[PDB]
Amino acid sequence: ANRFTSNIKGLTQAARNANDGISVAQTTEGALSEINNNLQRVRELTVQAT
Amino acid sequence: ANRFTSNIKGLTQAARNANDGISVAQTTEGALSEINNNLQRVRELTVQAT
């Protein structure tokens, strides 16, 4: 039972740690999406300029 | 989808650029027409003068 309790607490903490990676990836992906929009507008401008 | 959006924006801007060539050709054609009329009158004058 002591080993089982240790495992249960460890796995719960592991899931909590896992959620952090999801948060980081979401924020980073939003930033990259904004960069992508800027790049798209830059490409449109180059097409207009050439 | 990102590639598709880039391509659509590029093609729309390409058509927008294309219209400018039509405008240039129209203006130049008008100028050439006026030059042609003046040349025609010059030819008539030479026929009268010879």
Swiss-Prot record, chains A, B:
It is found in: Secreted; Bacterial flagellum. Flagellin is the subunit protein which polymerizes to form the filaments of bacterial flagella. Belongs to the bacterial flagellin family. This is Flagellin. The lineage of its organism: Bacteria, Pseudomonadati, Pseudomonadota, Gammaproteobacteria, Enterobacterales.
